Design a protein around this nucleic acid. Structure first.
Ligand code: MN
Length: 641
DNA sequence: TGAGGTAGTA
DNA sequence: TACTACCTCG
């Protein structure tokens, strides 16, 4: 779009596969008794993990880079309450082609096991899975921090080893929960180990043999505190230092594992166009809409609820709002609620009266509330159709970031459009889908930006579902609501929509929706947005920019949407064009620009495009509060930000 | 409950 | 997927 440059990925190309590696051994597996269908492939992979050596499951059999004579061919296996007796028959070598991706899967699996097994025999670094911690730079009062990197090893379509490296840290408590609590450290909110039925506490403990060595002390000397944020030292690295350590560790592991000499891979990068944020006029951040004016503001009524027991609006909030609305060319009406939650139903009555007099949202001035009470209050207001923005009461006028963000949140919750984009984009309706609020079940939800400008953010009623997969009919129904909204604002159907999915798109999840869209004459683009596994991106030379489009393979690409040096090293998004005919650069363009639409964050843009961020917040808040409160809440109002 | 990210933990 | 810590304010 702008300049096409160059980058490094945190992957490294090592030696190609020697002739022992291109033609892996084929092992036919025999179990006794023959398994059960749902439980076969995992059991088979378990067999591969039991024969030792570098072997993986190859379809209905096993593939091995290790000679069959240095594997435990015949063995016994326990699986969730069933004893299997396995035996492996070597059936020669089967040649695999890296160009064939289906077999490249197998080769890459073998590579991963290679990395694992070889990392096992490294003295004397700390090895957990494909991670390795090979130094210490931080200690503590009974806890130390190790420093290394998380790795991966796979094969390319060329047929050579590629090695992904990313600097990491490990938190290690070095004292038993007995000894640790004896040094003078507070109670850990979690603790990994190393009567109502006869056998007493001490008896059942010691007789279980769980007292052979350690002190007395559930127990105390029989567990270990898994320290987290509990017991500072920034574990975030500036991109430069991280890039360096990535190099160093790459070379080290390549050398100390007989994998060769690493060459940092270079990908072609493209600098994307600068988004045109707009309030009443051009802005650089949504917070500037409070001085410049709102993209679209009508006659609005906002109410105040003080729980700290005090007076009216603190003059700076009043004046800020007056500046914002005077600039937006709209009349403002501020109310004060003379009511309190301790009134019982009279409080809900107060809320009902407020709603009936046109109040669109309420600002809650209050000392730090507990999760319980905050939730109850939120939902209670919500049941009268009033979104609420909480602002903590120890609030001085100089804390401008906090209260300008609270104000922005308020305005966003009252149904105002605070910012918009001014450009040319392939889609004029962009909708994001996510599932969350998890537990025994999840909520599948959608949020949308309607119009080319994105000058309209809405949410749809989420739907309870068994897992992460959203039902096809639920997908099409939510999308239908987004469409219907678009037609309510534009008087027509959208020329083209952009479907964004948080995470990988399960098979045929969007089948129904895409068919419907196709019938109505609506062009679409389905894009899967994965927040991780995109690895890292570094400038081959020069400064690290913000707005990077890195087309990798076909239909997939990386996208660096946000970067600020002080926060650490940016993690690019991995995006897959799952369905559609729009060019990748155009989609990257639109998504990157959609990243700036989020109005509730006034001084920092989110990493995800606004509809996905909104969808995330939405399913979280719905899963947290409950869906039962949302019946009388307007969809133009972002109650969940 | 100010918001964002990058870091950590399950 | 959640949660907490620290940094800073496009
Ligand atoms: Mn908020």
């Amino acid at each position: 779009h702008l300049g096409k440059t160059e980058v490094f990925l945190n992957r490294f190309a090592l030696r190609p596969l020697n002739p022992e590696e291109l033609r892996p051994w084929r092992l036919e597996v025999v179990l006794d008794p023959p398994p059960g269908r749902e439980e076969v492939y995992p059991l088979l992979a378990q067999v591969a993990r039991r024969a030792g050596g570098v072997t993986v499951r190859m379809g209905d059999g096993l593939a091995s880079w290790s000679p069959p004579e240095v594997l435990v061919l015949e063995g016994t296996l326990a699986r969730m309450g069933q004893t299997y007796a396995y035996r492996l028959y070597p059936k020669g070598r089967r040649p695999l082609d890296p160009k064939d991706p289906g077999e490249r899967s197998v080769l890459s699996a073998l590579a991963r096991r290679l990395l694992q097994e070889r990392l096992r025999r490294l003295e004397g670094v700390w090895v957990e899975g494909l991670a390795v911690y090979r130094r210490e730079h931080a200690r503590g009062p009974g806890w130390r921090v190790l420093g290394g990197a998380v790795l991966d090893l796979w094969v390319s379509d060329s047929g050579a080893f590629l090695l992904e490296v990313d600097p990491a840290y490990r938190i290690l408590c070095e004292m038993s929960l007995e000894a640790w609590l004896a040094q003078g450290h507070p109670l850990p909110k979690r603790v990994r180990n190393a009567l109502p039925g006869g056998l007493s506490l001490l008896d059942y403990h010691a007789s279980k043999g769980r007292l052979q060595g350690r002190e007395g002390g559930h127990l105390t000397g029989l567990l270990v505190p898994v320290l987290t944020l509990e017991d500072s030292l920034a574990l975030s690295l500036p991109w430069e230092e991280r890039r360096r350590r990535t190099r160093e560790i790459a070379s080290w592991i390549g050398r100390r594992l007989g994998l060769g000499t690493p060459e940092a891979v270079r990908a072609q990068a493209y600098r994307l166009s600068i988004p045109k944020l707009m309030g009443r006029r051009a802005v650089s951040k949504p917070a500037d809409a409070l001085r410049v004016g709102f993209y679209r503001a009508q006659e609005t009524a906002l109410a105040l609820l003080r729980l700290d027991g005090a007076q009216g609006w603190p003059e700076f909030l009043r004046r800020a709002l007056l500046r914002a609305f005077g600039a937006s060319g709209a009349s403002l009406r501020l109310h004060t609620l003379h009511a309190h939650p301790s009134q019982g139903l009279a409080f809900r009555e107060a809320l009902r009266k407020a709603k009936e007099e046109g109040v669109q949202a309420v600002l809650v001035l209050t000392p730090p509330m507990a999760w319980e009470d905050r939730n109850r209050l939120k939902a209670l207001l919500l049941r009268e159709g009033l979104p609420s923005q909480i602002l903590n009461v120890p609030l001085r006028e100089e804390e401008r970031h906090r209260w300008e963000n609270a104000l922005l949140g308020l305005l966003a919750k009252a149904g105002l459009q605070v910012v918009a984009l001014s450009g040319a984009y392939p889609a004029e309706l962009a909708v994001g889908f996510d599932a969350g609020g998890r537990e025994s079940f999840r909520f599948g939800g959608a949020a949308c930006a309607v119009g080319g400008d994105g000058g309209h953010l809405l949410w749809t009623l989420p739907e309870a579902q068994a897992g992460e997969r959203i039902p096809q009919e639920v997908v099409w129904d939510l999308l239908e609501e987004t469409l219907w909204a678009f037609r309510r604002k534009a008087g027509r159907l959208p020329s083209r929509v952009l479907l964004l999915r948080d995470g990988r798109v399960p098979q045929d999840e969007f089948a129904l929706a895409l068919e419907a869209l196709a019938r109505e004459g609506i062009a679409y683009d389905l894009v899967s947005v994965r927040k991780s596994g995109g690895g890292r991106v570094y400038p081959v030379q020069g400064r690290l920019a913000d707005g990077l489009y890195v087309p990798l393979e076909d239909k997939t690409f990386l996208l660096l949407t946000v970067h600020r040096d002080f926060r650490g090293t940016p993690r690019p998004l991995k995006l897959v064009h799952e369905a559609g005919d729009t060019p990748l650069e155009a989609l990257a363009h639109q998504i990157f620009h959609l990243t700036r639409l989020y109005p509730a964050s006034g001084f920092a843009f989110p990493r995800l495009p606004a509809p996905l961020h909104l969808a995330d917040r939405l399913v979280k808040e719905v899963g947290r509060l409950g869906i039962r409160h949302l019946k009388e809440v307007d969809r133009e109002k972002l109650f969940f930000v």
